[PDB]
Design a protein around this ligand. Structure first.
Ligand SMILES: Cc1ncc(COP(=O)(O)O)c(CN[C@@H](CS)C(=O)O)c1O
Ligand SMILES: Cc1ncc(COP(=O)(O)O)c(CN[C@@H](CS)C(=O)O)c1O
Lengths: 322, 322
């Protein structure tokens, strides 16, 4: 009868693409970026959170008011799970390393989830290990396990990829995306290549923790990428290669995106944009359409290295007389 | 050739409506809410910011790189103007009372705008006075003046109103909206009544500063409403009446919206929702479609009274061993 959504979860998906022409000056390729800040919790993680929880219900694995859901996260998946659990009536417990932004912690709690922070030194690997310990010691609990759950990849094959194909009217030549769980790059990549096998798919990881390129895990600032291990769901074969972007470059670019393009986005958005620009410099990519993603909104990073200096300045601002 | 937007400003507008069925339990009316978090800077102010600056350019009043734009704000307009200014190449100066959330300050600065906080005891009135002082003392400066600029009302007549009419397939019976500048309630109200004169339009103001109902200005927590004076653009005649909601009720409702409805929204969103439910309680409104707005995303309020306590708790969390 109307266009009014029946459920808040129906607000997930179908995000816009927009061209960049400022940070791309002189690069010689088209660059379009998908804006995942237009999701109900303002990151791309709403997609796999919805898909995994719904899949578990269809499989008759979990039950509202009975099952405790437990999930490891660098923040966004945690928020998105907290959001789904709030709506569907599940107790939600997240594990997250203590080095991720304060805003991530507060938002999870605002949706009523319980949060356990883990040793910072042990990174996402430690947060996953803690989640398994909690699972083993909690009656009637279930872990969706984003790093191993194929519904994660599938949602991107089903929705994020088709959205890119349709919005570019089949013209996308290159897709680049940083890897956290690997769900996005794997699902979008598999889909785009099923429509045009010439499409080139690139992952991105932090130079500091370049494990996919054979390096050692280490601390870095690109929250949402570089978990320090190869996720089970990551499809290595679909990617041409995994590009490396330094934490410093990713952070610097995210700041420029706000100041020059009007896009207040997260650190992984900056990393993706650096990677896309690097691809544009290559002779073989001149005149091609490169699509990447800005996976999260910048206000979730006020306390991170991205904006903490500004935040401190802002906290010390004082009123003037009128 | 594609659906890719040419400019980031084209990401503004066309936001969804969603039904509420949890906070509305037992109320006997339909309640749908418009989600302005789906804007590029995550609040309703992107609409009037774009409309006012664009209108000024069309009238040949301002020039990028020459004109300094000055605007008084409670935060969201400031952010939206900083955003438009960053993209279009204007120097931007905002005045805002020092009592509004820290997040508002940081986001404005992230877009490169200059921010002057004003004495908190003087509220939005003082912030407007300061903006006029800066205007008088700054060469080649211009103030859009959201409280007096008809382009503010007009953008809602043109876009927010029509979106509501179309999305409800003409079925909306009642629209309710808190008043900051009064642009939204005025423009939406004017449009809806133009389509169906029987549609009833209600404003909201804080119980603490109920100046539209003849009370005195006072401090309150409903940021974005209750500026403490009647804005020039506010169309009193289009409203049945201006409802009063307490700061306490608005804040409590915003918290419940997150926990129960999965909607992480700001304090004025809570206030609108309280008002919507109060209207639903009247026998005359049973079975009617009531539409309201959630004008801003909740992460901009982490340091405000809305989530301050949770934020302090979050800051105090410590990592556990793995
Ligand atoms: C800001 C940000 N940017 C990129 C990604 C990557 O998307 P993937 O499809 O998971 O590879 C993520 C996903 N972060 C997951 C896993 S680390 C989380 O727990 O929040 C992210 O949060
Ligand atoms: C969170 C929030 N909620 C409601 C409104 C009101 O919309 P109006 O069309 O202005 O009446 C506003 C508008 N706040 C303007 C004027 S106070 C600002 O300077 O930010 C808002 O920020």
């Amino acid at each position: 009868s109307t266009n009014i959504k029946k459920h808040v979860s129906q607000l997930i998906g179908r995000t816009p693409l927009v061209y960049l022409n400022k940070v791309t000056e002189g690069c010689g390729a088209y660059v379009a970026v998908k804006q995942e800040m237009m999701q109900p919790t303002a990151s791309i993680a709403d997609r796999p959170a919805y898909a995994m929880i719904t899949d578990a219900e269809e499989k008759n694995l979990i039950t509202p008011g009975k099952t405790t859901l437990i999930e490891p996260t660098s923040g966004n998946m945690g928020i998105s799970m907290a959001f789904m659990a709030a709506m569907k009536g599940y107790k939600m417990v997240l594990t997250m390393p203590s080095y991720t932004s304060l805003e991530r912690r507060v938002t999870m709690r605002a949706f009523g989830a319980e949060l356990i922070l883990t040793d910072p030194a042990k990174g996402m690997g430690g947060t996953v290990k803690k989640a398994y310990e909690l699972l083993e010691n909690t009656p009637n609990a279930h872990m969706l396990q984003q790093f191993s759950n194929p519904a994660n990849t599938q949602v991107h094959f089903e929705t994020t990829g088709p959205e890119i194909w349709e919005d570019t009217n089949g013209q996308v030549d290159i897709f680049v995306m940083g890897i956290g769980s690997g769900g996005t790059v794997s699902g979008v990549g598999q889909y785009l290549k099923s429509k045009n096998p010439n499409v080139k798919i690139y992952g991105v990881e932090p130079s500091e923790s370049n494990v996919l390129n054979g390096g050692k895990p280490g601390p870095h600032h690109i929250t949402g990428n570089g978990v320090g291990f190869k996720p089970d769901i990551l499809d290595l074969d679909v990617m041409e290669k995994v590009l490396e972007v330094s934490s410093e470059d990713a952070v610097n670019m995210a700041r420029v995106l706000a100041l020059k393009e009007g896009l207040m986005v997260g650190i992984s958005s900056g990393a993706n944009t650096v990677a896309a620009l690097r691809l544009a410099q290559l002779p073989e990519n001149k005149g091609k359409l490169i699509v990447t993603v800005h996976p999260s909104f910048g206000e979730r990073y006020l306390s991170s290295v991205l904006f903490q200096e500004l935040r401190q300045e802002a906290e010390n601002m004082q009123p003037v007389a009128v």
